[PDB]
Structure formats: structure tokens, C-alpha cells
Subunit: 153 residues, 12 copies
């Protein structure tokens, strides 16, 4: 099964900036950890990784999850989580399972980070586990897609 | 007269997703309905259609309108209606007629859809008629322009 | 089909006061324009016009609509748009098409004009086109009704 | 005991519109149910019923309750509950017991129904029991009037 | 000159209810005091008195101040002061001077009395002087209409 | 009919403290008044009374109403009305009729008493009648239970 | 009887700045108009005029209305109307009648002018009549002090 | 390692009430699934399960995580998530890792569920995965405690 | 005189956790300091100490105070200060002196600590002095009681 | 040690006005009570008293404290507590102990008295004890200073 | 050019207190830095410096700028920026260019510093550059005064 | 010094639309004025200019400032100032000085312009001076870079 990992604005700077707040592990390193999670689990999962600082590129990518190629999305929308009704609508419209991940606990930071339009549109949200949250999302997504398959059969 | 029809984020997914909310007519089907409204009315209107999920492509397109080709805009900014001061400002600086259309009644949904920066910047707003709203906007734009050329 | 045109408080003062805000066409002149739109289109539409400054007369009239004479309402509730839950409720219980019209763009004036209880209760809202907005509403109501009789 | 039952706007449409929210029992049926309750408990109570969509008619009627004819009021102000400081003041100035009734639970619907200016002016408030709430009010009104008289 | 005195909902109950809050002087007594103010001043003023509990009657009356019969309005809108955008618009549209009077200080009571849509539409507001406020409004209106006349000449 | 009457925090201090606000009738007296009301109307109703200052004991007790012993609850949550989402959820999950009672009019006191999470979860709410409100609730509960059974 | 007229911050610039908003009549001219109002009425009133841009000077002056010399105060607190809980408390503590005057209608301007801590502390408020409001306050104060005298006797 | 699973008010009614909103799987069934997760993983984890409808019992239990017996807590505070500053403080004071779990997405329900005092106090939050969220929390906690151990050595 | 010292949720963890926020003196050490303040002053004061994490145990204890044993309460409600209308109400109905103490300055922390329902219900509040605040409260309670017995 | 006692606007009117709100003891009487508390305790405390209605005189005085004469401030800013960021800032920059006192419980009055910029800037706040609050502050300041000289 | 530099409350404590927030450069040093900037660019500018903790002295001084002596004002109102509608009005009534300066970024501190009534009244606002901001203001003031004169 | 000047959405329309609000000077003219300012003060500064209507292009460009090419950024984010937490975070993560400029005074326009997420992330903010503000920023940037180097 194909799982699309979408990483939003500023995430490409992971490990390179503000280690104290977001950690030393880079985005390329998180994605290799996700692939090793699959390999070791022998999961029937093909991951695709996509990062962008553009709202419109995120939406275009989500819409491309139309065709029977991608089954689920794992998304960290970054700061667009708090502001983008347009990505939230794209998630609602996608009609495939979407899981939201935040490295930090967005309940425990500035008041302006508390709202997540996107996260409200997603089936589930994971926050404050750093990079591990992404392996937690994989685990979850595999289970959700298998349970959807059982129900269809 | 040249009329530019701008369709904002997610609008291209019409008729393919969430039919009970946004209906079964696709974006291509709305646009051919608008064309038929023109043809069948022998209106002297040349339509151009543009869809995008990018706020900046919308601004670029509104600014591209400045050069005596395009005379009015009919815009559905989608979710950017509620969030984009930047598009509101582009509308303000465009210095020609802009009508906002919404498929749904944005007073009757989530609280976060009630604010419209863009609609506040347009001369007129139409909402809740589905696709017919775009034909309503055409009727308006043609009367507005007609009346503008007489007053000049 | 019978269409009822309800004009709320102050609307009768049109063209006699504050022309730079609400224009120079009077309420009688808008209504004869709507009639001409019907006649000149050979629409099978019988218009009835009603103006009042009384919230209760508006409710009475919406309820009087219940009996298979009137098929849709075109309403400009005036200032009651922003304050009258009671008219919103009458609209909800009326069980037929209601379109709200506003002469001005109520997203672009005082903050207290942004809320519309009534417009939230209507299928569609039109604002900011001046008098033309009522012709836009007629076009809509006729298409809505047409489409309703086919689906029955 | 002469007890005035005032029914506010839209209440005359009971049973005739939106049965799923407000029930199939009509206003006339509720008033027969109140008389049946007065009989089958031998309350020395004479009911007077008054329905209106006019705020001012409700205020006129409350003021009429000045003369030693009517001893208490049972009121369902409808949507005026949420908006009418004028009816709340009329209640306050009346100096007779008033009891507010709502068919629905106005803590469990839209946010705009939670405020009741009127309810706050009343001695007590009943909500969410449908037509029975009016009998519950009768029960309390007879009791309140008894207490006042024992004190006299 | 003709001055219209509009008294809003509940005002007809003055002196008869809640003396403690609104006083012992009745509405009919305030209006006789206003007429005696004119008579004694030898003011060229004809007063018309109108009370109603209907928003629509107030608006109808204000609109009737169209014809060159009434020059100014003195209004106590009562509780409609706080709620009626429709009366505020009627005042704005009237294009004759309108003065708002409150018996009580509506800054010193419930929070819901603080907003006055109507008072914001009026040229001036007088509050908290009881019945005297109405003679204060007369004095003011006479002066305003005389000053308007001088300016036109 | 087994009907559980739950009385929330501070309610056991009735009559013993602040008589001017909450009356001189004690909680024990209110419960005798409820039994007297069941007798003098031959309601086939058995009352169980429970008072506590613990939120969790109220939730434990509502959950106990799972087994086909207790058919309905009459609750005065006290100050937990304004604060306890946990009791409101217990009410929602109970799937038996619940009716909320307050001695005072909680629309007419401090701003912090106006919210009732619990009341919103209940089928109906009664306030401002003092001890009588509990009898009013009984009346409604017996009726609600009858309607449910006729439907069964 | 002695009536103290307190004029708050910026009022000394009347007639000299922003004529369009506050008028051409200067503060010294308003005070002469008030004195002519007394003279012509033959009112038993001695006026004292005091302007200051200092909150503390206003409060000190109000407290000086302790001794049986001043019977009433007519105050335009200016912008301190909206901000000074300290002047509002001084008014409450004074226990003599105080009337608030605004040249403009503070209901019809910026949202930040709508609150009047001071005006809520005063028995009455007059706003939007320009200079005339001060003669309206005099009229009112004379009537209030005479009515207080009758009641004491 | 000992992991304490705290389940808050109403959770004991899982599977028995409102299946549509919270599911058919009971609380006792979730806890057996967590134990099978451990057994199958061969994790060095001893689970203790505790449910209560009492705020004070939750706090007492958290404080009992003082002694070097329990290393981490997995908590679903239920409705106390939104209201209990006292449990949030107990979490802050505990100085052991605490993970918050919600069955539902509390961003996508009533406005009153959006605030989580407790979740802000926790290192991480998981929401909207139903029962699976608890196995996701276990996975996370095992990883967090192992990483803490490596760092101490 | 008997003085009851009530310490609310988490207070028992003092000096064992978060020393930089709440200090290094334990709850037992504060209480023996209060005892020494009494002894060393030969005050005629008998202290009783009570800590709990349960809102209902606090209410129970305030109500238990009603019987002419206990003359005043010194309370630190902890986090319940900000949330418990139920304890505020218990304080109001207790009908004797209650002083609230907080170790920290609750005006100078998170916004959610600024509201104190309980402190609004107490005669006096002390905050920000650490443990010394409890000795300050003792000094106050003894002067308050002294002055109360003279006035009786 | 030198302790400066600053009394803000209106405080000089104590005991001469509104006795039921602020009591009958004058400002001079409070200050001689504080002196007696010192003398009778043989505290090594030299008090200086300052009252003013001027925000700037308060700031001037706090800044004048900078020079090794004055060691701590006891302040009642009066109404400036709720409005003066400028005094809050002066307190922050003063770099020595400041205790705020209020005669009344400012959590239990108008909503506009609940905010205290100044009290948020002080180490400790005392409110609701009347004049005794100033003796409480003295006790605190002496213990705070004592403890500060030992730690140096 | 005579340019008045007004420094508001607490500003005279620069360098003497809280160096970590406001720097180690004193107010006197900032004013020498401004003179050095006028020299090393030959601005025909004469500076006058005025610091005060009194709102009324700031208003008195702004009013003094009436007479054709002072052509512009450079002001750092301190905390009065956030609270003084009176100083904002004095700025508005002055009819000479005024420029506001803050040492710190008042968008990046407490929520209560974000509002500036004064800044809103000024032609421009500078923040977050420390002492340099005053030179930046000088630069703009000389330019603004030039533009006005070219126009003259 | 390589200094990047980023100009946000709508800024390329300077001088071409709404001259009354934003002036007649074009973006190209502002950038020549900045070069002229660098010359006539011999700042060893090389400017790079970048304008875009795309939020993501602004973030891409700020990230490009990672490599030791560009030492500081001067940014006018346009309307993204009020809405873009994403650009504010890019500013924060950049770890080079950034200075925000606005042509207009964003404290003196609509309420929706007062918030600046970006400005809050920046070292300083300049507003209301028109084109000159960019030179003021240059002045500060060269200084800030000097201070950092002296420290190096
Ligand atoms: C290199 C930057 C990573 C960021 C992650 C996030 C950012 S910025 C923020 O813009 C957002 O508020 C929270 C966030 O999505 C997270 O914690 O994962
Ligand atoms: C295929 C999606 C169409 C949408 C239309 C709209 C969306 S999403 C929403 O994002 C917006 O709130 C309302 C809206 O502009 C409309 O009703 O036309
Ligand atoms: C002659 C007055 C006409 C009015 C129209 C309207 C008014 S007043 C207002 O009271 C309302 O806010 C807007 C409005 O409904 C519209 O623009 O059509
Ligand atoms: C036929 C309509 C009945 C209505 C009743 C009510 C309405 S409308 C509403 O306008 C109001 O909010 C609640 C209400 O008073 C009730 O539940 O009884
Ligand atoms: C007999 C009732 C007189 C009233 C006057 C007024 C009422 S009710 C109120 O409804 C309104 O809030 C204030 C008011 O207009 C006034 O003080 O004059
Ligand atoms: C002896 C105390 C009785 C109380 C009742 C109530 C209290 S306290 C309050 O805590 C609550 O706000 C209202 C209330 O439920 C009622 O009016 O019945
Ligand atoms: C020369 C300035 C006169 C002013 C008067 C007033 C000002 S400023 C304002 O500071 C205030 O908002 C209203 C005001 O008190 C009034 O209209 O009288
Ligand atoms: C049987 C009830 C389970 C509940 C779970 C929850 C409840 S009630 C709620 O009280 C809370 O808002 C969310 C919640 O913690 C969750 O989704 O896990
Ligand atoms: C060991 C924990 C002590 C606490 C004290 C307090 C807590 S937690 C808090 O929960 C409360 O907000 C403030 C408080 O009451 C105080 O400062 O005394
Ligand atoms: C003689 C006036 C005394 C005052 C004291 C106070 C006042 S006015 C008030 O202006 C302030 O809100 C509370 C206060 O500081 C206190 O209770 O000590
Ligand atoms: C020695 C104190 C200097 C201060 C400056 C300022 C203060 S206090 C504050 O009171 C204000 O909020 C911001 C301010 O104007 C600035 O950053 O320049
Ligand atoms: C040609 C448009 C220029 C604009 C500038 C600005 C705009 S639009 C606005 O979108 C923004 O609120 C303020 C602003 O950044 C400024 O004053 O420089």
C-alpha cells in the first residue's frame, strides 16, 4: 500500500535550525527511520515523501491522492495547521484516511498554535513525540488500512 | 468585453467529491453553462477561466488584469475568502468590478466561514445558489459594465 | 407561479433620503423594474409587493404564505436582518424558497451589520448590487421553482 | 384566579410546520390540554389565551394585566426571549408573577438561544418538556398565588 | 416650530410602576411640564406627544417627520435604544435634528443598557436627570433650530 | 417507577444557611414534599434520595442507574451544573430520562451561573420555583415515562 | 451657590486646534457664555473654572469640594473619562452632585471612547451639543441644588 | 518497567453506552489488548490499570507514582481534561513521563472539548484513533523510557 | 478559639517537587511553623490541619465547621481556587471567617490562575509570600475573631 | 531598615467618605497604628509615609527609593492598580521588595477592579482585611528583609 | 529645525535598572548620540530634551509646541503608549509631525503592550532597535520637515 | 554586507494603483533610493531585491539566506504580516537579523492589520514613513551587523 508523507513549511530546516526546540534529527533522517520501520516490520507499505513551503503544493498533492495509487496520508502541515482552512477542506474532500503529526505539543506553546483547522479535519492527531510521532502515525495508518480492508471484504 | 472567472482552492474537485455539500456539477460543467448563457444571450462577453490552489497565482492573475484586456472579475476564492487579506488587497487595488460567488451560504455553516475579507473588498457578493450563482454574477457583471460605459 | 416581495424597515424611504448610500431609485421604481423583467421575459410569475416597518407584519406575511397561493419569497429585511431571530425562525418554518437581498454589501459596513440571522435561514443571499439585486433574485427564484416542479 | 397565557411569535404555526423540532400538537391543542388540567384538578383558575407575532402587542397585553383582573402571566416569548429587553422590562414593571415556558431546551440548541432577557425577569423558567411545560407552569402559578394570599 | 416628542416602550407606565427606579412623575405629567416650559419661555414651539410600545410605530412616526411640518424630534426609545438598528437607521435617514433622552444613567446600570444604537445616530444624548432631561432637550432643540435658521439666512 | 433524586453539593445545607437566597425548607423537608405529591396523586412511583458534595459519587450513582432498577433521574447538580462536563457526559451516556432542577433562577444571578453543561445534556430544565420545582419534575418524569411506554 | 466647572486634558486647546471636530468657540469663550447665562437668569450661582491636563489635579480639586464652599461640579474629564477609575472613585466619594459634559457624542466615535468610568459615577451625562451642553448642565445643576434644598427644608 | 494506565470519568462505560460515538470495545477489552501488545512484543513492561470518576483519586494515584515503582503514566482524563487544572498540576509535579490519550478527536467536537489543561502538561497527546491510541501510547512510552535509560548511562 | 487549616490539591507534594516554583519547606514544616507562631505568641488558638485532593472532602469539611467547635478557616484551595464554584458556595454558606492563602502570586502566572471563585467568597486573600503567608493569615484570623467577640 | 509606605489616589479621603465601603479609620490613624506595631515590637524599622493622587509622584517616589536609604515598599496604588502599567514598570525596575495592599477584596467588586498590573509586579499582595492589611504587610516586609540580609 | 525629544515614564532609569531588557546606555547617553548624529550629518537641527513620569507634563509640553518654535516631536511615551488616550489626543491636536519610538519590540512582549493609542496618532512608529531608533526618527523627521517645506 | 530586501504581495503594484494610500513612488524607484542611500554614505553593502505574491517563495528565499552569502533581511511582508505564522517561523529559524518595514502605520488602519506575526519575530519594526522606512532599516541593519562583528 502507498502512504504519502507530506511535510509542510519550514520542516526542511529540521536539525539545521533551532535544535533546542525541534531537535537534531533532520527531515531526511526521519524519513529513513520511517523506511527502516517498514523494512523491519515487513509492512506492505510504499512511502512517498514530499516537503513544501507552499500551501498550494500541499493541496495539489492531496488532490493527487485521488487515483487508486495512494491509500493514506501522514501530514505535518507546520504553521498552516493553524491558518489553512483551504488544506483542511482538501483533507475533508480527499475521503482517504489522513493523520496529523506535530513534533511539538501545540497545546503547550503560544496561544496562536492551539487551533488546528487541519487536525480537526483529520481522523487522528499525534503531537509532542518528536520524530517518533511519525513512526506512531505509520503504525496507526497500517492498522487503519488493514481494518478498512477487512471491512470491505 | 473580457470577463475573467477565477476559481480558488479545491473548486477543481467539484462534482468528484462531497456531492451532498457542493453538488454533482463539475467545474468544467459550470464553465460551459456560463458560456451557453453568453452565447444564447448574444452577450458581447469573452470569458476566461482560471482555477488554482495557490493564493499567489490568484494575486498574480488579478494584477495581470490591469492591462486593458480584462474589464471585470468574477471570483470564488474558496477558503481563501475567510483568511486572505492579501487577495482582498489585490481586489482593492485592481480598480475594476469584482463579484464574489460562493456555492454555499457561508452565513449558514461553521463560524470560521462567516468572515470574508475578499467579499468585503468586492462590490457585490452572491452565495447559496450553487452553480446558478455564477450565471447570476455574469448577468450582474454585464449590467455593471454596460452601465459603466454609458456613464463614461 | 406567485412570488412575494417583502421590503423591511426604512426601505420605503429609498430615493428620498441618503442617496449616496442607497441610491436614487425609489422602492416603487425597483418594483416596476421587477415587473418589466417578468413581462419582457414572458415569465409565468405573478409578483406581490409588501413593505413594512413592523417585524410582526413581516412574520404575519411569511405565515400567510403557507396556503398554496405563494411559491417563493424574495426578502430584504432591512435592519431586522441583523437582529430578528423571530423572522429567521419564520423563514425556517415557511417551508418554501426564500432569497435575501441587500442593496449594500453588509460585509463592508459597520461591524453590527455583518450578522444576518435571516440570511443564514435563507437558501441564498445577494448583496451589494443595488436595485439590480432584486432582478438577480427573480432570475434565481424562477430557476429554483422551475427546477423544483421538474423534480416533483 | 385569572391567568393570562401569552404565546409569542411563530407559536401559532405549531404542528403545522417543523413537527420534528416543535411537535405535532397545535397551539389550540395545548390550550385545551391546559383547560383539561385545570378541570381534572379543580383549580379555581380561568385561562385567557393570547398569541401574537408583535413585540408591542405582547407589551400592550402585559400592561393590560395592571387592573385587578389578571393575577399572573404564563409566557412563551418565542425568539423575543433572546432579543427583547423591552418585554423583559414590561415583565419587571408588571408586579405580578410571570413564568416563562419554552417547548425546547434552549440550553441545547444554537448559541444565540441561550440568552433569555425575559427569563431573567421572570420568577421561574421551564424548558424542554414540550406542551406539558405549560401545565407545569400552571401548577407553579396556582401555588405562587396561594403563597402570596396566605401572606396577605 | 413643531417638535415631536416620541416616548418608547414601557414609558406609559411611568409613575405607576417601579417609582423607586423611574420616579413618581407620570408621562402625562412630564408632557404638561414641557408645555409649561414653552408657555413660560414664550417659545415658538408646538409640541406633539406620541408614546408607543411598537418599534414599527416609532419608525412610521419618524418617517412622517418628512413633510415640512415637524422640525425636530426628542426621543426616549426605551429598551429599543439598545437593540433597534432599525430606529437608528430611521433617525439617520430623517435628516432633521434628533435628541435622545434617558431618565436614568444608562452607563450606570446593566451591561446590556450601555449600547445605544439610536443614541449614536442622534446629534446629542441626555441621561440620568429624570423628567428634567426632557426640558433640557427642549432648551437644546430650540437653540439648535434657531442656530440652523440663522445659518440658512 | 423507580425515580432517583440526586442532590448536588451544598444542598444538604438547605434551610440551615442563607435562608434569604435558598429558603428555610430543608433538603429532608423537600423529599417529604415529593412523597406527599406522589401519594396525593397516586403515582406508581418509588423515590430514592441521594445527596453528595462529590462529583464522582454523582457520576457513580448515575452509572448505577444502568440496571433496570431506576427508570429516570431528577437532578439538582448545584454548582457542578456550571463546571462539570464529566457529569454532563454521564447524563448523556445514561440513556434514561434526566430532568434538571434549580431552586433559583440561574438566568438571574451571577454571569458564571448561566452556563449549565448538565442542563444542556438533560431533557428539560426547571428553575426559580424553589422546592416546588422538584414536584414539577416528578409530574414531567411520570409523563415522559408514560409516553415512552405507550411507544413500547 | 458655588458651582465648580472642571475641564480636563486638551480642553484648553479648544477653538485653537481641530475646529472641524470640536468647534471654533474657545474654552475661555464657553466660560463667559456660562457666566452670561447666570447673569441673565439672575441665578444665585458663583462659578469657578479650572482646567488641567493632570489626573491628580482633577482629583485634588474634587476633594477640595469637601468644605461647605462648593455645592456642585460640572465636569468634562476629556480622555480621562474613558480611562480614569481614579477620577470615577473621587466622584463617587465626593457625595455632591456631579454632571458630566462632552462636546461630542462619545457613542458615535471610536470604540475606545464609548466607556466612561466617570460618567457612570455621575448623576447625569450630557453629550454632543458642543458648548451648549455646559449651559444645559448649569440649568440642570441649579434645578438639582434647589430641589435638594426644598427636600432638606 | 511499570506503566500506570489511568482511565478517567465515564470510561468504565465504554462499549456499553453510545457505541456510535466511543465504540463497541469495552475498557476491560482495551486493557487486554494492551497486555497482548506487551506479551507479543516481549516488552519489559508491567501494566497497572486504574479507572475512576473521581478527580481526587486520579491525583492521589499520580502522586503514588512518586516511589521508584512506576516509570510512566498513560492517561485518558476524560472530561477532566478540559476542566482540571488540579490534575494538570499533579502531572507537572510528577516529573515522570505522562502521555495523554483520547479516543475521539477533541479538536473536531464541541468547542468546550478543545482546551486540554492536562494535555498541555503532558509530553505528548494522541487523539482520534479509538482503542489503538492506547497501543500507540505504549509504543511511545517504551521508546521514551529506553531513551531516558540510555541517556542516564 | 479553634482554627481549621485546609490545604487543597497537590499541597502535600510541597518541598518534594518543583522547589524553584513552590519552595523547599514541606506541608508538615509549614504546619509546625504555624504551631510555633501560636505557642510562642501564647495565642488562645487551637489549630486543626486538613489536606486533600478531593473537592468534595473540602466541602464536607467546611460544612462540618458549622457546629460550635470551629471559629474560622484558613484555606489554600490550590487549583480549585480557579475552577470550584462549589467550594466558593460552601465558603459563602459557612457563615464564619475564611481567609484564602496562596504560596505564589496568582496575578503573576498563567492567565488561567487569575480567576479565584473561592477568594472572591473569602473576606481576605493573601498571595505570594510563600509559607509566611499562612502566619500572616493566623495573625489576621486572631485579630478578626478577637474583634468579633468584642463586638458581640 | 527604612520602609516607605505609599498611599495612592483617594486614600487621603479615608474615614471621611463612604465608611460602609472603606471603614471609619482615617489614613493618619492607619499610619499611627503601623508606628505602634513597630514600637511595641521593637522592630528596627523606620517608616516613611507618602500619599498622592498623582501617578507621576508615585513613580518619582519609587525611583527616589533607588539610593541606599529605603529597603522596601508597601504600596496601595488605589485605582491605579488596575490601570497603571507605568507604576507596574516602576515597581519592576525598583529592584527591591514591594508588597501591595488593598483595603477591600478586589476579586469581589466590579469586574474592572480584578486586573492589577501593579500587584502582578509585586512579590506579594494582601487584600480585604481593611487597615490590618498594612500591619500584615509590615510583618511580611520585616521577615522578608531579615531573611534577605542573612542570605547576603 | 527645533525638534523636541520627549521621554516618558521610567525612561530616566535607563542603564541604571534592568540592563538585560532595556540596555546599559543611559538616557543622557542616548541624547549625546542624537547630537553626534546631527553633527556628523550637518542637519540644521537644534534638539531639546524632556523627560517626565507625568502624563500631564507630557501633554503640557506637546501643547507648548504650538508656537512656531518647535517643528516636530520625537516621543517615547513609555507605558503611557498603551493607556493614554489623553496623550494620543494631544498628539492629534498638535498639528506638527510626531514620531514614536520604543527601545523594545512591543509586538514581542506582553499582550498589554501591543496596543499603542499614541502610536496610532503618530505619523510613524519605530520599535526594537534600542537607542538607534531615536536617530532613525531624526532621519525621518528631517525628511518629513523637508517635504513639508518643498510643498510650502 | 549582502542584504536581502524582500517585498511581499501587492507591493509590485506600488505607484500604479491607489496612490492616495501607498504613494506614487514605484517599487523599482524605492530600490534605486536604497542604492543611492548606500552610495551617499559609503556603506559596504550589496543589495539584492526580491518581490513575490507567494508566501512559499518568501519562505524559500528566507531559507536560502542560510549559506554565508546574505547577512541580513529587510522585509515588508505585505498582508502576510497579519496572517503568516509560517513566514514568522521562517524568520525565527533563520538566525540572521531581520527588520520589518511597512509603508503605512498599521496601528492606524483596520483592526485586522494591527496583528503582525512577522513583526513579532523580527528584531525591529518600522512603519508609517513610506519609502524612507527602507533606508531607515538599512541604517539599522548596517549598525546591527557592526555590533555583531565587534562582538565576534
Ligand atoms: C524545522 C521546523 C519544524 C516545525 C514544526 C512545526 C512548526 S515548525 C510550527 O510552524 C507548528 O506550529 C508546529 C510544528 O508543526 C511541529 O511541532 O511539528
Ligand atoms: C469542490 C470544493 C468547493 C468549495 C467551495 C467553497 C469551499 S470548497 C470553501 O472552502 C468555502 O468556505 C466556500 C466555497 O467558496 C463555496 O461555497 O463556494
Ligand atoms: C431606504 C433605506 C434602505 C435600507 C436598506 C438596508 C438598510 S436601510 C439597513 O438597515 C440594512 O443594514 C442594509 C439594507 O437591508 C440594504 O442594504 O438593503
Ligand atoms: C412553531 C414555533 C415554535 C417556537 C417555539 C420557540 C421558538 S419557535 C424559538 O424562536 C425559541 O428560540 C424557542 C421557543 O420559545 C420554544 O422552544 O418554545
Ligand atoms: C416606565 C418605564 C420607563 C423606562 C425608561 C427607560 C427604560 S424603561 C429602559 O427600557 C431603558 O433601558 C432606559 C430608559 O429609556 C430611561 O432611563 O429613560
Ligand atoms: C444550600 C445550597 C443550595 C444551592 C443550590 C444551588 C446552588 S447552592 C448553586 O451552587 C447553583 O448555582 C444553583 C443551585 O443549583 C440552585 O439554585 O438550586
Ligand atoms: C480641545 C479638545 C477637546 C476635547 C474634548 C473631548 C476630548 S478632547 C476627548 O479626549 C473625549 O473623548 C471627548 C471630549 O471630552 C468631548 O467631546 O468633550
Ligand atoms: C465511555 C466514555 C468515554 C469517554 C471518552 C472521552 C470522553 S467520555 C470525554 O468526556 C472527553 O471529552 C474525550 C474522551 O476523553 C475521549 O475521546 O477519550
Ligand atoms: C505542592 C503544590 C502546591 C501548589 C500550590 C498552589 C498550586 S499547586 C496551584 O494549583 C494554584 O494555582 C496556586 C497555589 O494555590 C499556591 O500558590 O498556593
Ligand atoms: C478613601 C478611598 C480608598 C480607596 C481604596 C481603594 C480604592 S479607593 C480603589 O480605587 C481600589 O480599586 C481599591 C483600593 O485600592 C483598596 O481597597 O484599598
Ligand atoms: C528604563 C525604562 C524604559 C522603558 C521603555 C519602555 C517601557 S519602560 C515600557 O513601559 C513600554 O512598554 C516600552 C518602552 O516604551 C520601550 O521599549 O521603549
Ligand atoms: C501596492 C501595495 C502595497 C501594500 C503595502 C502594504 C499592504 S499593501 C498591506 O497588505 C499591509 O497591511 C501593509 C503594507 O505592508 C504596508 O503598509 O507597507
Amino acid at each position: 500500500m502507498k502512504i504519502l508523507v507530506i511535510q509542510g513549511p519550514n520542516l526542511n530546516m529540521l536539525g539545521h535550525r533551532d535544535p533546542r526546540l525541534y531537535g537534531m534529527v533532520t527531515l531526511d533522517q526521519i524519513h529513513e527511520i520511517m523506511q527502516t520501520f517498514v523494512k523491519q516490520g515487513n509492512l506492505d507499505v510504499e512511502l512517498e515523501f514530499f516537503q513544501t513551503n507552499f500551501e498550494g503544493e500541499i493541496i495539489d498533492k492531496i488532490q493527487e491522492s485521488v487515483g487508486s495509487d495512494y491509500e493514506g496520508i501522514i501530514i505535518n502541515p507546520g504553521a498552516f495547521s493553524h491558518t489553512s482552512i483551504a488544506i483542511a477542506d482538501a483533507i475533508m474532500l480527499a475521503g482517504k484516511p489522513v493523520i496529523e503529526v506535530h513534533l511539538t505539543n501545540i497545546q503547550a506553546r503560544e496561544e496562536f498554535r492551539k487551533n488546528s483547522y487541519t487536525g480537526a479535519a483529520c481522523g487522528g492527531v499525534i503531537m509532542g513525540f518528536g520524530p517518533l510521532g511519525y513512526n506512531m502515525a505509520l503504525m496507526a495508518m497500517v492498522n487503519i488500512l488493514a481494518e478498512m480492508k477487512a471491512f470491505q471484504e
